[PDB]
Write an enzyme that holds these catalytic residues in place. Sequence first.
Site, PDB file in Angstrom:
ATOM      1  N   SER B 149      -0.549   0.116   4.765  1.00 39.05           N
ATOM      2  CA  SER B 149       0.503   0.637   3.899  1.00 39.05           C
ATOM      3  C   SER B 149       1.857   0.445   4.557  1.00 39.05           C
ATOM      4  CB  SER B 149       0.284   2.131   3.617  1.00 39.05           C
ATOM      5  OG  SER B 149       1.006   2.538   2.472  1.00 39.05           O
ATOM      6  N   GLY B 150       2.766  -0.209   3.852  1.00 36.77           N
ATOM      7  CA  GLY B 150       4.130  -0.408   4.345  1.00 36.77           C
ATOM      8  C   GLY B 150       4.357  -1.698   5.100  1.00 36.77           C
ATOM      9  N   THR B 154       4.021  -4.762  -0.805  1.00 38.84           N
ATOM     10  CA  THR B 154       4.764  -4.652  -2.067  1.00 38.84           C
ATOM     11  C   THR B 154       5.741  -5.832  -2.274  1.00 38.84           C
ATOM     12  OG1 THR B 154       4.554  -2.244  -2.040  1.00 38.84           O
ATOM     13  CG2 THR B 154       6.419  -3.153  -3.322  1.00 38.84           C
ATOM     14  N   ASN B 196       0.618   7.310   6.700  1.00 38.19           N
ATOM     15  CA  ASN B 196       1.432   6.561   5.744  1.00 38.19           C
ATOM     16  C   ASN B 196       1.948   7.493   4.670  1.00 38.19           C
ATOM     17  OD1 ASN B 196      -1.197   4.338   6.339  1.00 38.19           O
ATOM     18  ND2 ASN B 196       0.925   3.874   6.936  1.00 38.19           N
ATOM     19  N   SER B 199       0.845   5.841   0.568  1.00 38.47           N
ATOM     20  CA  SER B 199      -0.378   5.070   0.637  1.00 38.47           C
ATOM     21  C   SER B 199      -1.015   4.990  -0.714  1.00 38.47           C
ATOM     22  CB  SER B 199      -1.393   5.726   1.593  1.00 38.47           C
ATOM     23  OG  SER B 199      -2.597   4.961   1.710  1.00 38.47           O
ATOM     24  N   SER B 200      -1.283   3.765  -1.140  1.00 36.91           N
ATOM     25  CA  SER B 200      -2.018   3.506  -2.363  1.00 36.91           C
ATOM     26  C   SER B 200      -3.497   3.834  -2.185  1.00 36.91           C
ATOM     27  CB  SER B 200      -1.879   2.023  -2.766  1.00 36.91           C
ATOM     28  OG  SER B 200      -2.745   1.780  -3.860  1.00 36.91           O
ATOM     29  N   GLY B 453      -7.094  -1.176   3.812  1.00 34.30           N
ATOM     30  CA  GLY B 453      -7.830  -1.864   4.856  1.00 34.30           C
ATOM     31  C   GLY B 453      -8.673  -0.969   5.767  1.00 34.30           C
ATOM     32  N   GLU B 455     -10.015   1.113   8.776  1.00 37.15           N
ATOM     33  CA  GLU B 455      -9.300   2.112   9.544  1.00 37.15           C
ATOM     34  C   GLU B 455     -10.255   2.975  10.284  1.00 37.15           C
ATOM     35  OE1 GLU B 455      -9.144   5.777   6.447  1.00 37.15           O
ATOM     36  OE2 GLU B 455      -7.395   4.424   6.488  1.00 37.15           O
TER      37      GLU B 455
END
Lengths: 145, 791
Positions: B149-150, B154, B196, B199-200, B453, B455
Site C-alpha cells: 500500500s502506497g 495508484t 498503512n 490500505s485497500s 501482497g 505479509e
Amino acid sequence: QLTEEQIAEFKEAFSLFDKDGDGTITTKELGTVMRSLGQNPTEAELQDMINEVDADGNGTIDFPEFLTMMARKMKDTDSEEEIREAFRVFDKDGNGFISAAELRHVMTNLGEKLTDEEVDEMIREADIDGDGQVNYEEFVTMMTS
Amino acid sequence: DGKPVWAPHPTDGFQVGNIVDIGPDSLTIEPLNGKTFLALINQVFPAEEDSKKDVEDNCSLMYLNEATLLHNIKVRYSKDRIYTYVANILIAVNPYFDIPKIYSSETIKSYQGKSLGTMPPHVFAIADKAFRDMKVLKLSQSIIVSGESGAGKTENTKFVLRYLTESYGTGQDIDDRIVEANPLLEAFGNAKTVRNNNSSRFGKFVEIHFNEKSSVVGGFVSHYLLEKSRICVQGKEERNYHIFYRLCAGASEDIRERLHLSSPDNFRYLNRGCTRYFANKETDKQILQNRKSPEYLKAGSLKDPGLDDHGDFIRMCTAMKKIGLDDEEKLDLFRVVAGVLHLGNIDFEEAGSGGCNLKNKSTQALEYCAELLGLDQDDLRVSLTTRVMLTTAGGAKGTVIKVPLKVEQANNARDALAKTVYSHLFDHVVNRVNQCFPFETSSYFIGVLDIAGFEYFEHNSFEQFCINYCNEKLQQFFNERILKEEQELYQKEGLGVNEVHYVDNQDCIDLIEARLVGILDILDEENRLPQPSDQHFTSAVHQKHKDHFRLSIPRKSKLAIHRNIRDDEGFIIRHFAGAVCYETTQFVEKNNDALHMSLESLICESRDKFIRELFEFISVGNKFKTQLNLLLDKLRSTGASFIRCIKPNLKMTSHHFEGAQILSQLQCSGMVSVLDLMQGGFPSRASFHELYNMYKKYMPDKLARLDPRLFCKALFKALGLNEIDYKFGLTKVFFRPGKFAEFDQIMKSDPDHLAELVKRVNHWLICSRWKKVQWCSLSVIKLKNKIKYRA
Ligand SMILES: [Ca+2]
Ligand SMILES: [Ca+2]
Ligand SMILES: [Ca+2]
Ligand SMILES: [Ca+2]
C-alpha cells in the site's frame, strides 16, 4: 526442405537485411538490400510477398518467415541457376571475374565497411588453384564451406 | 580471489565486502570500510566490478541475483530512472515527486508500437505490449502489479489507463471517469492497518474494454475478496472501513440524529480498533466535540498529508454528485452503514428458562437497527436468538421446528448479518461505479490488478494466512508465465533444446487447499467435532502432514519470539517469500461466518426497497478459496504482464533509497523467486550491439569495422567457448548463470592469448564474410523470383 547448414547461412543473410538487429525484417529493410544488389521492386510487390508469409500476423518478417519467403517448387536445374546469377552479381563489367573494386562494389553497396587491403585478402582465401581470381568451382566450394 | 562480494547489512540490505575466512555454513566478511562479521553462505553474492554501472535490463548484468538487482535499481534511482526491467517484468520505484517529461503526450506517442527492448524502461511499454498482444492474438490481457500500500500502485494504474485511452481511445476519457469514482471505492473498501493508513482490503481488477478494431469502448471494475472480518472487529492500531469514520466525523447534525450516530467508541464494530480520526489542526476544529472519542481527546488525531476523515467525507459527497449519485441514494448508503453499526451493539444473555434473550440495555440498539434496516423489532429479536430447522435431513417427510440459539450463536448471527449486509453494500457501490462507463459489448480487455501482497508480523493470524495463501497462488501463476516466456524466448532465439529445471510450489499450495487433507479442510473438520478447538485443529495439521517439506512446528523457527509457542498453538509454512509462523488461536472462530436462513430471509424482505435490491453452509476459508479461484480463472484466461511497485522509504521522501526495506519488498513481491527460476535457464544475455561496444577496444581495427553480429560471431568462435555455458542466439548471446562474468575475465586476463586466438580466427572470418554477402545475393535473387511466381 533446406538442410541444417543451408539454414545457418541464410540466417547470416537475414542479418544483412535486419540492419538494426531487432530480429525482424520490415518492408523498408527488405527493399534496400534487393535494391543495393541492382533491383527495383515496388512497395506493392514486397508487401504482397510479406503478407503471403506473415503467418503470426505482426506485419514483419522473422527468420522462419524469411525462409518460407525464399522457398518455392522447382527443379534441381532451376535452383543451381540461382547460384549462377548470384555468381554474376559481383562481376559488374561481366568479364568472368570479380576484381577488388568489384568484390568491393558489392561490399559498399551492401554497407560492409572495409579497406582495400582487406578486400584483396578475401580474394586470396577463395583462390584454390592459385591464379588470383574466383571461379564458379571455387565460389561453390566457398559458399558451401 | 579478492573480488567484491555483497553481504548482508541491516539498513542498506547489502554492503560491499571481501571474503577473508570460510566456515562450514558461514563466511567471514570484511566490509570495504577490520570489523569483520559472519554471513551465511547463501546470503553472500558476487558483485559487479563496476559499481557505477546501470543497465536498463538486469538480465544484462554479469551476475543476476537479489543483491546486484538491488544495487542496479539503486544506481538508477539516484539518476531518477524509476523504471528498470528484468526481461519483460517492470520494476517501478516510487519517486515521491512529479517527474518532468516522462508522462507527456510526446512520450506517450514515442512508446506506441515499439517493442519493449527498443525504448527505455517504462510503464507505457508494458501497456503497449499488452495492447499489441491483444490486437494480434485476439486475447484479453492482465497487467499484474505487486506492492505495498502506497508503493506508487495508484499512480501506476493511472498511467496505464491514460496511456491506453489517449493512444487507442477515441476522444472518450474512460480513465478520468474511473478515477473520479475513487473516493467512493476507497471509502467502502479501504481501511487503516498497522502499517498503512490507506490500505485497500479487496482485490481490484480495472479493465479497459475494446472492440474488434482494438479501440476503447469502456471500462469495468471487477472486485474480489473484500475482507469481511474487519467489518466487526479490528486490532488496536487498525480501523474498520473509512466510510464509518467519514460518516461519524463529517455528517451534519441532522444526518447524525436521523442515523443516531455518536463518537465511534460507542460502537462494538469500531471500538476494539483505533477510534481516532485522521485530522490536522484546521480540520480538527471542524469536527463537533460529540463525534470525538476519548482516545482521540487524549491522544489527538492521526496524521497523514493525504487523508482526512472530515474532508474526505466532503470529497466523497462531491464525487457521488459528480458521477450521478443523487442525494436520496447517498442517504440510502448511509442508512445501511449506520444500521450495521447499531446491529453490532445488540447484546445477549443466557435465558435459563432454552437459549438466549436480547439484553434489555440493547433495546435502543435493536430499535435503531430495525428502523434503519427496515425490519420489525420483534422479528429481528426472534431471528437473532432463534433459527428454523427441518426435523429430518435425508428425504423423509419432516416438520419445521424453532431452535433457540445460545448467546455465542446469537453473537455469530448478528455479526454474520452485519458482514452480509456490508458486503452486499460494497457490491452495490462497485456496480454503481461501473454504471459510469458502461458499454454495449466488447471483444477484449486489458486489466490492471491491485491486491494485498504477502505479509508477516510478530503475530500472524487467519487474516495473514488467507492473504499469504492468495499470494502463494499468484506467485505460482507468475512463475508459470515467466517460465513459458523464457522457454519461448530461447526457442525464438534459436538456442536449441534445453529444459529449465522448475521447482514448483504446488506442494505449499496443496498443503493449504487440498480437498480433505489440506489445512483449510482440516479446519472445517474441526467444526464438526463435539468440542471444536484450535489446538486439536493444529495437532491434526501436524499429524496429517508429519512429513511435509513446507510445514514445521513453531519450536523449529530460527527466531526467539517463537521459542515458547507450543506444537498445538501454531505452525510454520514455508511460503515462496520465506517462512511464516502462524499462531492458530481463533482459527476456528474465524473460519465461521454463516448466516442462518431465517435471518437472511428477514433482511431480504426489508420494508425498505434499497435494502431489498442489495440482496438481488460454507466456511470462511472455503469461500476464500472459491473466490480466489475465480480470480485466478480470469487471470489464467489472459496474456499476463508483470509490474513490481516499490516504496523507497516509509516517510514519503524523495531521493531516499532505504535498502533493507526495498530488499524485503523485492523478496515479498516474488522477484527473488523469479530470479531463482531464471537460474535454470540463461539469465544473463547481451545484444551484439552491447557486446560490440564493451569489447571492441580489445580487438584489432579489422574487427572493429565488422557489424555487431559478425564481430560477436568472430569473437565467440575465436575463444572456443564451451557449448553448454554459452549460446549464440539470433539477437543476443545467452549465458548460463555466472558465465558472462567468466566471458568478461577471458576478455581481460591474458591479452597475448586473446591476440593469438583472434589471429587464428582470421580464415573462418574471411569465409563467414564471403558467405554473408554471397548468400545475401542468393537471397535477393530468390526474392526477385518469388515476385515472378505470380506467373
Ligand atoms: Ca529489423
Ligand atoms: Ca511475422
Ligand atoms: Ca569483372
Ligand atoms: Ca581461382
